[PDB]
């Protein structure tokens, strides 16, 4: 969650204030995937070291 600070102002006497509600946001992060493959032959796996 993210937001900001409310906005103040220099007001005079008997002066109505203004609405100062802040805005809210939702930073988001997806999770992705990576992969790799190595094939081999049945001869190599028993002949190589």
């Amino acid at each position: 969650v993210s937001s900001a600070a409310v906005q103040w102002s220099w007001d005079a006497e008997f002066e109505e204030v203004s609405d100062d509600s802040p805005e809210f946001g939702q930073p988001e992060i997806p999770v992705k995937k990576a992969q790799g493959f190595v094939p081999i032959s049945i001869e190599a796996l028993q002949d190589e070291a």
């Binding site: 937001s3 900001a4 600070a5 409310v6 906005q7 103040w8 102002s9 220099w10 007001d11 005079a12 204030v17 100062d20 802040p22």
Partner: protein, 197 residues
């Protein structure tokens, strides 16, 4: 946890307002008087040695053209760009070496303390303002800040509607009282880099 979060937001707003108005306040209407605003047009304003150029001699001129009664009780205030530009004055390697890259911001300049204020002007090239006040030195005991009440918050329990009946809403009121101005304007030396159109 709405209440604590919004209290934190109120504190941030108060700081973000007051720190700005202490530097650049109109001084008329409902705003207090800022320092650079009260030092504008007064004998405190001087000009660089060469037009439209911030050189090494300009800092010295600002330090010099102020009387010794206040010069021994002064302090520096500027933006970070000005301090970095002063840092970049030395190339040959003597008598201009404030510090070397790889070190923090030095705490003294010409033997006096150093402060910073983000609300001051930054660049005289990209900005369209004719007046760019970038350096300040003077006795800051002549700038008075009068404060009356701290930051207080009151809880409104019932807001009303068009026909003067409750609508189911509650409120949070806050207020703050302060005032400031200059007393003696001849104890400052503000440098102005006027860019001609």
């Amino acid at each position: 946890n709405v209440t604590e979060t919004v209290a934190l937001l109120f504190a941030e707003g108060k700081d973000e307002l007051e720190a700005v108005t202490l530097t650049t306040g109109t001084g008329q209407g409902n705003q207090p008087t800022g320092i650079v605003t009260a030092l504008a047009g007064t004998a405190a304003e001087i000009a660089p040695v060469t037009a439209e150029t911030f050189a090494l001699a300009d800092v010295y001129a600002v330090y010099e053209q102020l009387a010794a009664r206040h010069r021994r009780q002064g302090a520096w205030l500027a933006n970070n760009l000005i301090y970095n530009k002063i840092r970049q004055f030395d190339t040959q390697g003597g008598a201009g070496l404030w510090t070397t890259i790889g070190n923090g911001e030095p705490s003294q300049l010409l033997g006096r303390p150093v402060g910073e204020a983000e609300a001051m002007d930054a660049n005289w090239n990209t900005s369209a303002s004719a007046d760019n006040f970038v350096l300040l030195y003077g006795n800051f005991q002549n700038y008075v800040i009068a404060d009356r009440i701290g930051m207080t918050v009151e809880f409104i329990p019932h807001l009303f509607g068009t026909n003067r009946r409750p609508n189911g809403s509650r409120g949070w009121f806050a207020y703050y009282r302060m005032g400031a101005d200059v007393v003696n304007p001849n104890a400052f030396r503000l440098l102005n880099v006027e860019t001609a159109s």
